[PDB]
Design a protein around this motif. Structure first.
Motif, PDB file in Angstrom:
ATOM      1  N   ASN A 128       0.818  -1.282  -0.025  1.00  0.00           N
ATOM      2  CA  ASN A 128       0.124   0.076   0.055  1.00  0.00           C
ATOM      3  C   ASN A 128       0.774   1.099   0.159  1.00  0.00           C
ATOM      4  O   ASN A 128       0.636   2.284  -0.757  1.00  0.00           O
ATOM      5  CB  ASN A 128      -0.926   0.038   1.129  1.00  0.00           C
ATOM      6  CG  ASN A 128      -2.329  -0.783   0.857  1.00  0.00           C
ATOM      7  OD1 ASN A 128      -2.786  -1.565   1.807  1.00  0.00           O
ATOM      8  ND2 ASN A 128      -2.861  -0.339  -0.265  1.00  0.00           N
ATOM      9  N   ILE A 130       4.093   1.621  -0.949  1.00  0.00           N
ATOM     10  CA  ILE A 130       4.631   1.983  -2.243  1.00  0.00           C
ATOM     11  C   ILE A 130       3.990   2.336  -3.263  1.00  0.00           C
ATOM     12  O   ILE A 130       4.178   3.475  -3.921  1.00  0.00           O
ATOM     13  CB  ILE A 130       5.401   0.629  -2.505  1.00  0.00           C
ATOM     14  CG1 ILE A 130       6.444   0.081  -1.617  1.00  0.00           C
ATOM     15  CG2 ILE A 130       6.271   0.781  -3.781  1.00  0.00           C
ATOM     16  CD1 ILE A 130       6.672  -1.323  -1.612  1.00  0.00           C
ATOM     17  N   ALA A 131       2.667   1.903  -3.464  1.00  0.00           N
ATOM     18  CA  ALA A 131       1.780   2.229  -4.468  1.00  0.00           C
ATOM     19  C   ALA A 131       1.288   3.817  -4.060  1.00  0.00           C
ATOM     20  O   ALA A 131       1.396   4.594  -5.160  1.00  0.00           O
ATOM     21  CB  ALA A 131       0.347   1.461  -4.639  1.00  0.00           C
ATOM     22  N   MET A 132       1.150   4.044  -2.958  1.00  0.00           N
ATOM     23  CA  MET A 132       0.681   5.455  -2.445  1.00  0.00           C
ATOM     24  C   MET A 132       1.695   6.505  -2.669  1.00  0.00           C
ATOM     25  O   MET A 132       1.366   7.692  -3.337  1.00  0.00           O
ATOM     26  CB  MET A 132       0.135   5.552  -1.184  1.00  0.00           C
ATOM     27  CG  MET A 132      -1.280   4.719  -1.154  1.00  0.00           C
ATOM     28  SD  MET A 132      -2.482   5.497   0.206  1.00  0.00           S
ATOM     29  CE  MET A 132      -1.537   5.298   1.577  1.00  0.00           C
ATOM     30  N   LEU A 134       4.531   6.413  -4.915  1.00  0.00           N
ATOM     31  CA  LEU A 134       4.379   6.513  -6.250  1.00  0.00           C
ATOM     32  C   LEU A 134       3.536   7.182  -6.792  1.00  0.00           C
ATOM     33  O   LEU A 134       3.671   8.143  -7.804  1.00  0.00           O
ATOM     34  CB  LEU A 134       4.455   5.127  -6.988  1.00  0.00           C
ATOM     35  CG  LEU A 134       5.927   4.128  -6.691  1.00  0.00           C
ATOM     36  CD1 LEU A 134       5.810   3.006  -7.546  1.00  0.00           C
ATOM     37  CD2 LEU A 134       7.045   5.060  -6.798  1.00  0.00           C
TER      38      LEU A 134
END
Lengths: 198, 156, 67
Positions: A128, A130-132, A134
Motif C-alpha cells: 500500500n 509503495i503504491a501510494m 508512487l
C-alpha cells in the motif's frame, strides 16, 4: 476387576446365613438354634467345656469385643468409606485437571495458527505505501509542471497589464496637461447658457 | 490505485517486539499518504488556451509553450520496490506453512493423548501399574530411594 | 466645447504614434525598469521568457524486509 458390594451375610458375627438356609428345608427356621442349644448342652454336661477362670476371662473379652464393635464400628466403617471417597475424588479431579490442561494447549495452538494466518497484513501495508508514494510523486509532478507553465503564461499577462496601465495613466495625464497648453466664442456662449438657465 | 484495506490491531498482533518501531513508522506513513492523496485531485485542470490565446500579445511564444506542454512526456515512476517485498512475502508464507504443519503435528498428538486420558478405566478397577502408566508422575522413585517405603517419610 | 476639444484633439494626437512606443514619453522608463524588476523578481528569478526544463526527484526507500 471390580469388588463386589456386600459380603457373605454372617449372623452374630459367627455363623453365615448359608447355614440357616441349608437347615431350613428339613428343620425349619428353628433347626440351627435347636442344634446350637443341643451342642452347647452336650459340651457342658459331659465336661467337654470345663468351666474355669477362662470362662470368665472369655466372657469379659467377648463383652469388650461386642461392645467395641457395636459402638466404634459405624465410625470405622465411615472412616474407611471417607478415605476411599477422598482418594477417588482427588484422582478424578487430577484427571479433569490434566484434561483441561491439554484442551487449553490445543486451543492455544489453534490460536497461534490463527495469528500466523493473519500474518500477511505487514506486506499488504508495505505494498500500500509503495503504491501510494508512487502515486503521490506522480501527482506532485503533474501539479508542478502545470503550475509552472501557467505561472509563466500569467507573468506574460501581468507584465502586459501593468505596462498598459502605466502607459494609459501617463497618456491621460499627458493629454490633460497638453490641452492646457492650448476665445470670445465661449465668452458669449457662457452668457447664452446663463440665459438658457431659466 | 487498488489498495489493500487493513486492520490496525491485526497489524499490531503480527509484529515481533524487536520491530515495533518499524510497524509504527509504517502506520504513520500510511496515514500521511492517505492524507496527502486526499488533499490533491488526480489530474491537473489543463487550462484552456483561450484566455492565453487572446491576451498574450507576444510573438507566438504562447504557441510554443503550449506545444512543449501537449508534447511533454512526464516521467511515471516505476515500482522497483514491490517485487522484492513480494519475494519476501513468498518466503514468509513458506515459513508460516511449515510452522503450521508442525503445529498440526502437535495438535494431533494432543488429541491422541486426550483420547487416552478421556478413556481411562474407572478408578475403582485400577491397579497401581495402571495409575503409574496413566499419570507417570505417580511412580515411586525406586532408583534414589531403594528401600521401603520408597519415598521420604514426611511425604507419607 | 473645451473638454470635447480636449478629448478628440488629444486622442488624435495620441494615435499619431507610429514611431512612438509610448507617445512622446521622453521619461517613465527610469521607473519602469524598477517596476519590471520588482514584478519579475517577485514572480521568479530565472528567465521567464523561455520554457522551464524539468528536473524530477524519486522517492527514497529503505530496508523493509524482515531483518
Amino acid at each position: 476387576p471390580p469388588l463386589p458390594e456386600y459380603g457373605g451375610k454372617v449372623r452374630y458375627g459367627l455363623i453365615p446365613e448359608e447355614f440357616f438356609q441349608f437347615l431350613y428345608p428339613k428343620t425349619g427356621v428353628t433347626g440351627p438354634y435347636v442344634l446350637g442349644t443341643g451342642l452347647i448342652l452336650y459340651a457342658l454336661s459331659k465336661e467337654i467345656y470345663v468351666i474355669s477362670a477362662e470362662t470368665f476371662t472369655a466372657l469379659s473379652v467377648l463383652g469388650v469385643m461386642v461392645y467395641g464393635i457395636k459402638k466404634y464400628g459405624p465410625f470405622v466403617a465411615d472412616f474407611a468409606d471417607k478415605l476411599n471417597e477422598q482418594k477417588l475424588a482427588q484422582l478424578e479431579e487430577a484427571k479433569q485437571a490434566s484434561i483441561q490442561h491439554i484442551q487449553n494447549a490445543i486451543d492455544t495452538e489453534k490460536s497461534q495458527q490463527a495469528l500466523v494466518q493473519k500474518r500477511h497484513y505487514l506486506f499488504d501495508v508495505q505494498r500500500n505505501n509503495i503504491a501510494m508514494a508512487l502515486e503521490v510523486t506522480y501527482r506532485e509532478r503533474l501539479y508542478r509542471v502545470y503550475k509552472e507553465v501557467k505561472n509563466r503564461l500569467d507573468y506574460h499577462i501581468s507584465v502586459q497589464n501593468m505596462m498598459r496601465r502605466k502607459e494609459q495613466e501617463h497618456m491621460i495625464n499627458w493629454v490633460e496637461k497638453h490641452v492646457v497648453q492650448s476665445t470670445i466664442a465661449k465668452c458669449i456662449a457662457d452668457l447664452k447658457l446663463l440665459a438658457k438657465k431659466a | 490505485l487498488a489498495l489493500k484495506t487493513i486492520d490496525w490491531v491485526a497489524f499490531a498482533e503480527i509484529i515481533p517486539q524487536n520491530q515495533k518501531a518499524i510497524a509504527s513508522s509504517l502506520k504513520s506513513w500510511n496515514e500521511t499518504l492517505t492524507s496527502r492523496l486526499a488533499a490533491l485531485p488526480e489530474n491537473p485542470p489543463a487550462i484552456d488556451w483561450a484566455y492565453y490565446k487572446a491576451n498574450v500579445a507576444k510573438a507566438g511564444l504562447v504557441d510554443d509553450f503550449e506545444k512543449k506542454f501537449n508534447a511533454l512526456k512526464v516521467p511515471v515512476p516505476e515500482d522497483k520496490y514491490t517485487a522484492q517485498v513480494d519475494a519476501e512475502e513468498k518466503e514468509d508464507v513458506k515459513s508460516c506453512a511449515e510452522w503450521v504443519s508442525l503445529s498440526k503435528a502437535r495438535i494431533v498428538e494432543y488429541e491422541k493423548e486426550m483420547e487416552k486420558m478421556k478413556n481411562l478405566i474407572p478408578f475403582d478397577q485400577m491397579t497401581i501399574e495402571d495409575l503409574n502408566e496413566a499419570f507417570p508422575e505417580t511412580k515411586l522413585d525406586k532408583k534414589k530411594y531403594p528401600y521401603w517405603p520408597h519415598q521420604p517419610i514426611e511425604n507419607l | 466645447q473645451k473638454l470635447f476639444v480636449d478629448k478628440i484633439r488629444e486622442y488624435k494626437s495620441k494615435r499619431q504614434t507610429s514611431g512612438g512606443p509610448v507617445d512622446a514619453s521622453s521619461e517613465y522608463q527610469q521607473e519602469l525598469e524598477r517596476e519590471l524588476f520588482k514584478l519579475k523578481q517577485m514572480f521568479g528569478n530565472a528567465d521567464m521568457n523561455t520554457f522551464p526544463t524539468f528536473k524530477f526527484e524519486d522517492p527514497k526507500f529503505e530496508v523493509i524486509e524482515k531483518p
